[PDB]
Amino acid sequence: FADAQRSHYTVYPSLPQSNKNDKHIPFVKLLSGKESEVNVEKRWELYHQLHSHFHDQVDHIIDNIEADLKAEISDLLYSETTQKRRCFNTIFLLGSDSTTKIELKDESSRYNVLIELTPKESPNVRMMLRRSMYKLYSAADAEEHNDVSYDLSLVENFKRLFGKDLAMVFNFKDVDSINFNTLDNFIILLKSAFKYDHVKISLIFNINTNLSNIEKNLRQSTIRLLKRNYHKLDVSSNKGFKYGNQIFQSFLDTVDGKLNLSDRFVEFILSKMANNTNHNLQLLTKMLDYSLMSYFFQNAFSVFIDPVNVDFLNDDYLKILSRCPTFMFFVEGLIKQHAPADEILSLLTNKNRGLEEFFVEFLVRENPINGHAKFVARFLEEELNITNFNLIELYHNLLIGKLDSYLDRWSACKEYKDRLHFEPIDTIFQELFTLDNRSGLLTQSIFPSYKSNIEDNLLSWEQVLPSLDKENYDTLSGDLDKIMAPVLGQLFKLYREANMTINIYDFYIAFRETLPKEEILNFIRKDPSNTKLLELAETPDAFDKVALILFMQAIFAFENMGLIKFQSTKSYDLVEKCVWRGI
Amino acid sequence: ASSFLDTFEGYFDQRKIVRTNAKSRHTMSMAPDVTREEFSLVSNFFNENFQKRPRQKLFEIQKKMFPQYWFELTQGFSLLFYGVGSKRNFLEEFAIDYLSPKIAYSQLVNSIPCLILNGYNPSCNYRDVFKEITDLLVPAELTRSETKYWGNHVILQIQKMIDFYKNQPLDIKLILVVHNLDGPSIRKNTFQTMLSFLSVIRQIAIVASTDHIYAPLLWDNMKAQNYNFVFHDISNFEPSTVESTFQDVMKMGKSDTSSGAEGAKYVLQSLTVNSKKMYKLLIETQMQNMGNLSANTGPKRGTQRTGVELKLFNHLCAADFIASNEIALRSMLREFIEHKMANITKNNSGMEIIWVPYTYAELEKLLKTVLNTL
Amino acid sequence: RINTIKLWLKKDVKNVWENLVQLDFFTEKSAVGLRDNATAAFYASNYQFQGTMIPFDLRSYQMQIILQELRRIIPKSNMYYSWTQL
DNA sequence: AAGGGAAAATAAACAATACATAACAAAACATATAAAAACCA
DNA sequence: TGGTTTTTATATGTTTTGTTATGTATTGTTTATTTTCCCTT
């Protein structure tokens, strides 16, 4: 009984005695091992005070998106004094995630029960009622401080058993996932409680998508019941951009004066946040964190955003910052303006003091785009009463210089487009303190081309396995490794060049012609120890049997990856291909 | 053959009608008839000698990635590994040898418990996994107002566990390691819903892996939020000789993939002779009850009705001298229960039925190929 | 060929379509209305049928009263009587 | 520029497979009460 | 020992969930015939 053949076993692993060090942080020494340990632990705690200052405000923001939504739904749930008094007030929550709690009033000489129904809790109509009558009878004995049949006769006996009148509220959670035959028959069932003179029902529909999809599903006589008083409340994190603008402004407050945002990064943020419209704010936070995680892990100059560590500056730091492309443009500008060589030489590395004294000058500039974007977003808010705008693409067009070409769409900033005008200037050494994606890490870690990374490793495979030259002539198979592909990579190019339906036997022979016949049998004989394997190699049928064994574990590995269908069970001779590269 | 090879262009151009004369119908019977024991002989030689030296050097390259993954698990990211080849020996060497001692040192003694989870096993049950997690965390079990009228106690206790652990200190105290998160019994919706809500808990660190190429189709916007994976490509062209154990490779993968009886054939090969004589007696007695009750040749998978009860089974294996008493019977049964080759449950009268979860045709094939050779 | 007759819209015939369903002129396509006993009516309430889940205008229905019966009941003076025969 | 002629399309009869649901089983979830078993006293 | 409370064994009920069989609908397979434009002339 091996643990590899079990499901869900638990290892209590053995830890060594003490590894002599307080080195237990995941940051590594940069500059290929030239960075000191005190820089690594400083870059660790300067990360965590810049990471926690960002999430203390985002947790403050998220607690305001629910406290606003509890209060916005509660202004609208109460006080609509209808004079007809024989219907239910329906609240459609457009685009709402079903993760908002609803607080009802205390409001004595009245019971206010909240009854929440998920589509898993609604298989049919009697299960919607037996849970609804259990949830009100359990929540009325909780406030009370004999048994009842759980049906809608509990609603008529409610004053005759509890002394106070009722006000029950239904909160349907995933109404796009419930079937609408059951929800139609349950609203019609609740319609029978309008003869009791002491109850009022209130329905809340968390419609994630659309109201137009719901009214094509319900019957027409139910919509005429839902229309005596209904209220559409648009509930989204993406409405008016007002909560995405607060998290991105909270990010720019943390990195104000110490990190810059390249426009190649900001429009990546802007494009990936448009591909997910339901859950933006967790995905906005995920991209700003992983880029902030990426900066402090990869830059040795991450310790140079607080000024107290500038008095540390070293020689390998001086060899790596001078290849900044703005710094060469500055030396190019001193060539073209000032002829003599000595002041440029005092800038370069032959003056040991001057270059490190040159870098202490440019760390203290405010770099004022972070406050000016907050200045524009507040000024464009209260003057023009403009709500519907991204601060993210406002910050993106401000990095380029296309600010007034973005403001002309509202057609009311023509008297203010000259006072808000701002052309950004390229500060020196701003490539060393910036967030950018020119390597392609965020669209490989967070948003990978999943299947395209699978077929590229199958087809090419030279980017994956190391092609080494010295060590192979020592080992058992290095005469075979230069002439033979790995079998999943060899079979994939026979897979790729083939048609939809392929015979296994013709696909076996076409595989077998690719292999070297002499060196597979030379490799199968180069082990002298296995007598049972050398006995297979003496047979004339040795290459035809080794090729089939090696074929049909790769034709097996391509099925549970999902690349191959076995068409037409009872037959087992031909297969259909599932997956094409490039798609 | 075709002019285009890869795009939607290659999709539309390779799906042509082939004529009847153009079809070259060769049966796979025109092949070298390969014995199973020389299948294992040639495969274990190529998987242990063909490209070790590239795969060993590749594994030394991506071992330098281990502090970069550990920085991500301390920031609340679950962590999915994809690629071509077996990721199993990567995953349990990273999580046991590297990850678990170094979180424990960074929280200052004993290491973090590392519940690893073989999802290539088609018998992986989500209630047994959650039975294991509540033994490790010991959560406050669910009060009566929290059990909401036939609510699901597995899901409703995770939701109590999230609200508990949102106020606890941010310390990893469990590392659950899911091999093949898109495997056959674990790709189901109730298993993924469990592991997504369980991934919200920042005190436990998810380290998962996937083999299927349409694996991202398995998580919508809500499950990808709760997971919030960071994806890593580890292609290493490893053999997957342990994943090719629960699933017959001689049949090239048409062994139905969800039986679990082919993986039971591997378990019988290294047991005690007194533990195989018991399981043979258990199979033959249930095979009597399947041919009696069903009156049907077709494949129906064996359940509680066809099973032997436990006190009647003790009389059957005391006459054939397998078990001396009830306790020695129950001690050599439970090794089959932990591998789910036999199940014990009680009926509506109190009879404690023991039964084997396989179909009738898989039960007579298993009886002849490993058990009846003695 | 012909004062004029109003053509009701797609959104307005939906109410007319649902009344002919509940008056037993249209039935669901392969439908089992009432079951024999209490356990078969309980097994059907836990199953979630397909016609429930497909959209409204795509449900296949069938016909309680055929057109040859529908010509014989409608009087010869209706303006729709000429359309009770193909 | 014409034209051959093979790929592609159409149709129709037939066989093979998938699908929707009926019928049911079984496990999770739930309550009840007489007998054991602690347990104060 | 002696009453009282608490747990367990036995017994049945409820709701969700997963499996299988089957009649009907869909889809593939083969063969004859017609239209379309690529590749030689």
So where are chain B's domains? 51-252, 253-374
Chain A residue with CA closest to C16: the answer is A220
Q: In what order do the strands lie in the sheet with B174-179?
A: A9-11, B114-118, B174-179, B204-209, B78-82, B229-233
State how far the Cα of A350 lies from the Cα of B145, in Å rounded to an integer: 77
Tokens of A312: 């540390």
State how far the Cα of A534 lies from the Cα of A141, in Å rounded to an integer: 82
Give, in Å, how far the C1' of D12 lies from the CA of B26.
29
Residue located via tokens 């390597």: A439
State how far the Cα of A430 lies from the Cα of A198, in Å rounded to an integer: 70
Tokens of A188: 């019609």
Report resolution in angstroms.
Answer: 3.0
Residue A232's beta-bridge partner residues? A92
Of A9, A131, A457, which has the smallest distance from its Cβ to B84's Cβ?
A457
Residue B95 per-residue DSSP state: I
Q: Do the bridges between strand B229-233 and strand B78-82 make them parallel or antiparallel, or are there none, so unpaired?
A: parallel
Chain B residue with CA closest to A531: the answer is B41
Experimental method: cryo-EM
In sequence order, what are the residues at sequence separation of 6 or more whose Cβ sits closer than 8 angstroms to the Cβ of residue A536? Answer: A524, A542, A545, A546, B38, B41, B42
State whether the Cα torsion A466-A467-A470-A473 is positive or negative: positive
Please report the number of interchain residue pairs, chain A to chain C, with beta-carbon separation below 8 angstroms. 21
* Side-chain-side CA neighbours of residue A183 (13 Å): 27
The CA distance from A256 to the nearest CA of chain B, in Å, is 23
Tokens of A237: 């994190």
**CB atoms closer than 10 angstroms to residue A179:** 16
State how far the Cα of B305 lies from the Cα of A486, in Å rounded to an integer: 49
CB B303 within 8 A of CB B363: no
Return the closest-CA partner of residue A380 out of A410, A355, A350, A351: A410
Q: Do the bridges between strand C61-63 and strand B352-355 make them parallel or antiparallel, or are there none, so unpaired?
A: unpaired
CB A296 within 8 A of CB A43: yes
**CB atoms closer than 10 angstroms to residue A412:** 13
Tokens of B221: 């916007």
The CA distance from A220 to the nearest CA of chain C, in Å, is 6
User: Using N-to-C axis directions, what is the helix angle for A531-538 and A542-551, rounded to 10°?
Assistant: 120
Return the closest-CA partner of residue A504 out of A427, A577, A438: A577
- The phi, psi pair for B80, rounded to 5°, reads -100, 135
Are residues B28 and A508, on separate chains, in Cβ contact within 8 Å? yes
Are residues C55 and A126, on separate chains, in Cβ contact within 8 Å? no
Kind and range of the H or E element at A116?
strand A111-117
State how far the Cα of A371 lies from the Cα of B186, in Å rounded to an integer: 50
State how far the Cα of A483 lies from the Cα of B123, in Å rounded to an integer: 41
State how far the Cα of B337 lies from the Cα of B343, in Å rounded to an integer: 6
Q: Please name the amino acid found at residue B358.
A: Y
State how far the Cα of A363 lies from the Cα of A156, in Å rounded to an integer: 75
Q: Enumerate the nucleotides of strand E whose atoms come under 7 Å of any protein CB.
A: 10-12, 14-22, 25, 29-31
Angstrom distances, CA of residue A409 to CA of A133, A373, A388, A412, A540: 54, 18, 12, 8, 81
State how far the Cα of A265 lies from the Cα of A283, in Å rounded to an integer: 15
Give, in Å, how far the C1' of E41 lies from the CA of C69.
69
Nucleotide minimizing C1' to CA distance for residue B151: D29
Return the closest-CA partner of residue B264 out of B167, B117, B347, B363: B363
Cα-Cα end-to-end distance for chain B: 54
| Residues of chain A contacting C14 with CB distance shorter than 8 Å | 220
Cα-Cα end-to-end distance for chain A: 43
Are residues A445 and B114, on separate chains, in Cβ contact within 8 Å? no
Residue A276's beta-bridge partner residues? none
Give CB contacts under 8 A, 24+ apart, made by A559-566.
A559/B252, A559/B253, A560/B211, A560/B212, A560/B243, A560/B247, A560/B253, A560/B257, A561/A454, A561/B84, A561/B211, A561/B212, A561/B213, A562/B212, A562/B213, A562/B214, A563/A495, A563/B213, A564/A495, A564/B253, A566/B253, A566/B254
* Side-chain-side CA neighbours of residue A340 (13 Å): 3
Residue B216 per-residue DSSP state: G
